[PDB]
Amino acid sequence: GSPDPKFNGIEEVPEDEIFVEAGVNASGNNFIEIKAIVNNKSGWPARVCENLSFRYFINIEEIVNAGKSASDLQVSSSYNQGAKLSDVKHYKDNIYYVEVDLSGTKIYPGGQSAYKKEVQFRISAPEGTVFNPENDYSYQGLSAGTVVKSEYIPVYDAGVLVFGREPLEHHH
Amino acid sequence: TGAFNYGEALQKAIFFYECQRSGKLDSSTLRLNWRGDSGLDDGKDAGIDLTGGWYDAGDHVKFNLPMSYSAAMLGWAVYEYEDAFKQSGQYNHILNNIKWACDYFIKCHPEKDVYYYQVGDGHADHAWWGPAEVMPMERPSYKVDRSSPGSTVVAETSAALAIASIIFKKVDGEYSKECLKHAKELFEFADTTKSDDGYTAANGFYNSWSGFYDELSWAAVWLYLATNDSSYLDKAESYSDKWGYEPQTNIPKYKWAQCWDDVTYGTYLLLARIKNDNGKYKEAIERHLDWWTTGYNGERITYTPKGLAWLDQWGSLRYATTTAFLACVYSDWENGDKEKAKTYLEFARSQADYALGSTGRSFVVGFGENPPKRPHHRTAHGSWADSQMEPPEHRHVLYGALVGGPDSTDNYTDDISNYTCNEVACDYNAGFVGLLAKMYKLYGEL
Ligand SMILES: [Ca+2]
Ligand SMILES: [Ca+2]
Ligand SMILES: [Cl-]
Ligand SMILES: [Cl-]
Ligand SMILES: [Cl-]
Question: Interior CA angle at B142 toward B136 and B148, to 5°?
Fold first, then answer.
């Protein structure tokens, strides 16, 4: 006889290797501020990632209906070493997003400070303008004072989607 | 018979070497999905490409002495039992892995009398706990040369490449010739320097304890078998008075095992078959294998109650399974003592079966009943947090790894930080692969 030739070490990947955890860091009538922690717990195989980015999607319907536009939103942060934050960018319809780009920073499963990087960013409308997070795609399932893994904050590796989903309606 | 699936164990014990690969990998042909590119800057401090080779154990140092010893022993298995490898479907697998190490030894030999013998700093390497692909620390390379030589590691490398030249002759004649050229040059370098003064970066890990005369004779006898140039046979025999005697005697030493430091015992056996003159090499191998089995002149190695021949607390299974391979090879020598061959072969079977499960549990990761699941191995564990305890279970199965094994009364614990028990290593698996090939031939082929 001879051993089963199907034998291999191609294992089931039992867990999501690269993902963002997020939560509400602060909020007010006209803004939301997100705490986001990008994780690389890769194992199949482990790898170093130095071109990761993620996108946080909002719906500006309530801004437009107030007679304002995306140009009235302001992205800010006092906590973003190693992360570039975009201005709001148009996706489709009244869906916009903030890109958070950690390219140039090595994130890898090699220690407590290596496998995860925290970013904080705030999106504000003008004083007196209602900012409604409840209709924002990437706000779904977020809470104050805690971070949780979210499939609604998709992660990209050199601009290629590797985890989560973009807001495809109603269209996929 | 037999009592265990030796063919499966052999398959897995060879696969273990794929888990140890350093360098650029081809993910489209790998038999696993949890190893990636690693050590890609190996050699850059020296201005030379030293990528590839095998990580030694559960760490990421490339230690060329055990690495070349292990490739030599795998190669010796293919040389003796080629058909067993073909019938079990493991022949291309074993050659692919042996070539992984030998391609590296060639890179390590950029000029006739220059040889790189290590990549990685042992202390720095062991100070961090995570997978190979994300190593954060610098990995220095080290070389020996005519001014600062390393006869031990250069001669063991010569031997591995000489063996590679034989087993690749038919499948890749051009590579075969390349291995032989390097093997001859390395042997001349080791033989004409006779010094380990330059071999220093492995201090505390793989010191040369027995000296380099065993390696010089081992490399020379393999070069004789590779070339049929009788000058190499003369050369191997010329150091017989230098290998070592039992303390206080002129009796060729016998109370140890074939291992990464000491290849005297396999040299006895190879020379005994070549000379076939009922002479001193026959006597020397028989003294050795008698001590390990029935006893020699009233003395016998320690055995555990459950039947393991137990040489030392470190790598107990490694020493017993490697000696069992020598016993297999002896048993197949037509001119050997037939009654001793019977005894030696039954010993080899018993030691194989102890490793595979005769005590009620397997000592081979990913094989048999209740195998070890926490081998001391960074990449199989897969910590993202520089900790042996996070996660508390290994992320990957290190199939085929033979662990250190039990103490002298069969006690063993499956714990990632228990070193005598759960160390794994290239040299632990090397003789074991040859033993498994013979067991598969005996029991698994019909
Ligand atoms: Ca909104
Ligand atoms: Ca030696
Ligand atoms: Cl196979
Ligand atoms: Cl055979
Ligand atoms: Cl030394």
Answer: 165
Nearest to B286 by CA among B339, B233, B248, B225: B339
Enumerate domains of chain A plus CATH numbers: 13-172 (2.60.40.710)
DSSP per-residue codes, B385-421:
SS-TTSSSS-SS--TTPBP----TTS-----TT-HHH
Q: Work out the minimum CA distance from B234 to partner chain A, whole angstroms.
A: 42
Which fold does the domain B1-446 belong to in CATH? Glycosyltransferase (1.50.10)
CA distance B368 to B145: 46
Q: Are B434 and B325 in contact (CB under 8 A)?
A: yes
Both tokens of B312, joined, read: 């030392």
Contact B181, B111 (CB under 8 A): no
Q: Find out whether B396 and A10 touch, Cβ atoms under 8 Å.
A: no
What technique solved it?
A: X-ray
| Extents of the domains making up chain B | 1-446
Whole-number Å distance between alpha carbons of A40 and B431: 39
Measured distance CA(B108)–CA(B215) in Å, rounded: 18
Ligand 4 center from residue B82 Cα (angstroms): 5
User: If you ran DSSP here, which 8-state letter would residue B366 be given?
Assistant: T
Ligand 1 centroid, distance to A57 Cα (angstroms): 9
Best mutation site among B35, B395, B433 for testing chain A: the one with the most A CBs within 10 Å?
Answer: B395
